[PDB]
Structure 1
Amino acid sequence: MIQEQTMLNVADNSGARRVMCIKVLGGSHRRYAGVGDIIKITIKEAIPRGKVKKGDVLKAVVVRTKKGVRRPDGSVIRFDGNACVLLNNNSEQPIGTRIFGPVTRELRSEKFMKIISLAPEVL
């Protein structure tokens, strides 16, 4: 359940540690963004020498929420934090090369095959 002004941790080696969601894409008056959802973000904190720079505006895909995701048995998978992987604005492919922490089965598609390829654990 990610909205605007929500801070997120960064799950890749793109160079950011802490980003802020500025827009939940895909629909008018759209309140929230779960996992697998694309969010336009800005960067609030970065490493000194990264691919990205503090104040850049780009997209990101949410991969972990503290609210969690439900499975068709009724089960739910919660995380302790909110994490996103940065994307390009246009090509919408991931920028980093090494994914940190687990991801979920809702992520897998033709679109995020790279992320499920690089994740150390897929729940």
Structure 2
Amino acid sequence: MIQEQTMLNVADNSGARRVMCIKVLGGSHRRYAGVGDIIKITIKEAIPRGKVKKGDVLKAVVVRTKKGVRRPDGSVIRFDGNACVLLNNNSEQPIGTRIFGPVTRELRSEKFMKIISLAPEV
């Protein structure tokens, strides 16, 4: 359950260490993102050698959440940290070459088929 002012750890290796959600996209008065929704990001902490510098506004996808993801069967998949993968605003597609940690099945929405191939689990 991600929203404005939610800080996120970054799953991919684009450069950013910690980011912050400045907006949830895809509708007016939209409260939350999660599961595999697009959000707008600002970079609050970045490594020196990364592709993206600090204080840069760009898009992202929420890959992991603490509140979790509900299945069709009634089961739920939670995690121990809110996490996202950074994207290239207009182009979309992931910036980083590789993704650390697991990512859920509900991310399988084509456009993100690049993201699932790189991820190690699920």
TM-score range, shorter chain: over 0.9
Describe the SS at the equivalent of 1:116.
Answer: helix
Structure 2, unmatched stretches of 5+, are none
| TM superposition score normalised by structure 2 | 0.98
Q: State the partner residue of 1:59.
A: 59
Distance in 2 separating the partners of 1:90 and 1:38? 12
Report the count of equivalent residues: 122
2:87 corresponds to: 87
Aligned residues: CA RMSD = 0.5
- 1:29-78 deviation digits (Å, cap 9, x = unpaired): 00000111000010000001210000000000000000000001100000
**CA–CA distance in structure 1, aligned partners of residues 103 and 50 of structure 2:** 23
Distance 2:21 2:104 in 1: 21
Percent of aligned positions with the same letter in both sequences?
Answer: 100
Q: Deviations over 1:81-121 (max 9, x none)?
A: 00000001001110001001000000012111111101000
The superposition leaves residues 4-47 of structure 1 with CA deviations (integer Å, 9 ceiling, x where unpaired) of 00000000110111000000000000000011100001000000
Structure 1 stretches of 4+ with a deviation exceeding 2 A read none
TM-score (norm 1): 0.98
Q: Aligned partners of 2:12 and 2:39: how far apart in 1?
A: 16
| SS of equivalent to 2:59 | strand
Q: Measure, in 2, the Cα distance between the counterparts of 1:41 and 1:115.
A: 18
Identify which range, 61-70 or 109-118, moves more after superposition: 109-118
Unaligned runs of 5+ in 1: none
